[PDB]
Amino acid sequence: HMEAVLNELVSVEDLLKFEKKFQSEKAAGSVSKSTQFEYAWCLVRTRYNDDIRKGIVLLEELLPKGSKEEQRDYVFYLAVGNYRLKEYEKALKYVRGLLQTEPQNNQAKELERLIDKAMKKD
Template identity: 35%
Template sequence: MKKEDYLPNLVDIESPLSDEELYVLSQQYNNEGDFVSVQTRFNYAWGLIKSRKVEDQQLGVQILAQVYKDTPSRRRECLYYLAIGSYKLGEYTDARKYCDLLLQIEPDDPQSAKLRQIIEDKLAKEGMIGIAIVGGVIAVGAAVLGAVLSQKKR
């Protein structure tokens, strides 16, 4: 099997945990109190990022950002899921930033390269939509201005 066959599939992130599974992670996180282990924080954040709820995804990104700061040995995993979490939240610039940091650590990682391409494709699509919206607004504005000017001539 190729290396990428062992890596988490990006499609997997789109399938959220069941409410029961997320509840188990939440309970474990809450039960550890002031001494939540790095693994528990990471697992809970991972589950939150997989959620369909924006609030959960935001909390997941916050927890992962803290794990990233606190635990250098988990940075690779954190960057990957921070990129995915940011992507899911529509924060594509942040997603790209995290992915670029990840690619600095592992420039030949096919998983990171694929994620980077997905982010770039989304940014390009969003850019085209933005251009279309601006173009539409300009066209409507020109039409309104033309109508107003033609009314004044009468």
């Protein structure tokens, strides 16, 4: 419970920090891929559905711009975002594709197990 409390307060701090940085950089010119990512990452972990959807959209904008390494990461967080929105089919499509490119990624494998467990129980 305390761990969950720590996690929730940190997520708020994170979101506010990167929202400011993203909006600041946006007004001054092109936003860096790093800042867009950090913000999208916080967004997909938010308690609000509109933030999660915004995070998913930002990650999708980053997809055609990133390196092979970065794109694999974007797909992972796209799976996480969709999972938290209960869009299991979309989440699974991402994860399964990620497992084909990164076989040794057990975090992706654990996410697929979590999605499958969630469909069975809930």
